[PDB]
Design a protein around this ligand. Structure first.
Ligand SMILES: [Ca+2]
Length: 48
């Protein structure tokens, strides 16, 4: 919990909680979290 950021229930909190990003920034290609938990907890190579 290194500098826990405050977000809503809709927004995605990082694994450590150090940052919050949008739910629209879950699964896009880039890494928005402190590590990469935003795309780690995401479908592994989406079919289509
Ligand atoms: Ca992302």
């Amino acid at each position: 919990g290194a500098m826990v950021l405050n977000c809503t229930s809709a927004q995605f909190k990082c694994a450590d909680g150090s940052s919050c990003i949008n739910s629209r920034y879950r699964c896009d290609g880039v890494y928005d979290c402190r590590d990469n938990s935003d795309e780690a907890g995401c479908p592994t190579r989406p079919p289509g």
